[PDB]
Amino acid sequence: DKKQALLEAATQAIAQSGIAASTAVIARNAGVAEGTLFRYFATKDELINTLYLHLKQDLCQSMIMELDRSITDAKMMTRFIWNSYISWGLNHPARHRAIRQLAVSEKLTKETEQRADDMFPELRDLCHRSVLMVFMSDEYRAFGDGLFLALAETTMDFAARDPARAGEYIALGFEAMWRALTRE
Amino acid sequence: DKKQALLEAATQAIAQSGIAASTAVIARNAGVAEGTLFRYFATKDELINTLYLHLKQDLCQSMIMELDRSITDAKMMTRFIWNSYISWGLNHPARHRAIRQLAVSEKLTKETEQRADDMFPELRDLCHRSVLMVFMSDEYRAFGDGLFLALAETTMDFAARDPARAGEYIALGFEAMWRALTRE
Lengths: 184, 184
Ligand SMILES: C[C@H](CCC(=O)O)[C@H]1CC[C@H]2[C@@H]3[C@H](O)C[C@@H]4C[C@H](O)CC[C@]4(C)[C@H]3CC[C@]12C
Ligand SMILES: C[C@H](CCC(=O)O)[C@H]1CC[C@H]2[C@@H]3[C@H](O)C[C@@H]4C[C@H](O)CC[C@]4(C)[C@H]3CC[C@]12C
Description:
Tetracycline Repressor, domain 2; DNA-bd_HTH_TetR-type_CS (chains A, B); DNA-binding (chains A, B); Homeodomain-like_sf (chains A, B); Regulatory protein (chains A, B)
């Protein structure tokens, strides 16, 4: 209960304010004592990592349910994964806004990145993963994650504002993302 | 004086708040009466269009000064234009933030788009323009402008936060933009 309420309140606050959002704000919006928040997350760094994992789990659970694992072709599988990301963020704009800030925050621990993958094996190799961002040195993976998230946010913005052409924006954004972030 | 002060104050407000920013806020921050602001811009729509042109002039004046017109190769010329855009936005983050919101606002008049080009012929054909976004139907030009601006903002974000690798981010972002938004 209170853990879920705190994570939901942290999601809204960071979506609105960035990793800077105050624990006090988060605690009151969750209707708990700030000391109670520290019982769940002793530090802002811990809240960042725990919240990132929470949102990442939610997102990937969404992707798992839309995925058809017959599909082996990487581009097609990647299109489906994109479309599920755009859907997720249109359904949950604060989750997207929060995860975008978390993803590029530089407070994510190697432990946490590790923890993400271990929690959804299905994504590792029911796609055969990647071609996406393989060309980049390790140091620039964060930047490529930022580029992906930038493209996706724009695609969301336009689809939300002009729903009659949502599929068109999604398809154009996909093609942009894929050309940006792959090599043949 | 007062026109320039109002345009500067509108730039900060929209960068912070979006096309929604209030004229009252803009007028006080410019230290003029709100009725005085209406003498310069009778409507928020007019302020949007006049401000967009103001920022667009500033940006393109920057580009004109960095441009070497010996360069005929479109990709190289486009790289230079990108690098000058990234520089401009790092030098003037509110100008970038404001122009990004204006560019996609749907309040820009055909008259204004017309007015932009007429004001800088040098950009029309000392580059031979485009290859950029030529593939898109007219209805999606705004979306492609949004994609460009999304890529550029990210490239700025990373260059500002990690100046030691600024050129690297700029070059990677360029290549992403160019692959997204051209076809051979
Ligand atoms: C699951 C697929 C990999 C499969 C493929 O390339 O086909 C990942 C490839 C790019 C990732 C996304 C990309 O790295 C940007 C974000 C990074 C953030 O840490 C997680 C959410 C992200 C939005 C993330 C979610 C997982 C995908 C969408
Ligand atoms: C001047 C060059 C065209 C030349 C070329 O393709 O080599 C334009 C191609 C893309 C444009 C940019 C792109 O359309 C996105 C923004 C749109 C906004 O209305 C003006 C600023 C913009 C940031 C704009 C400024 C002019 C360039 C940078």
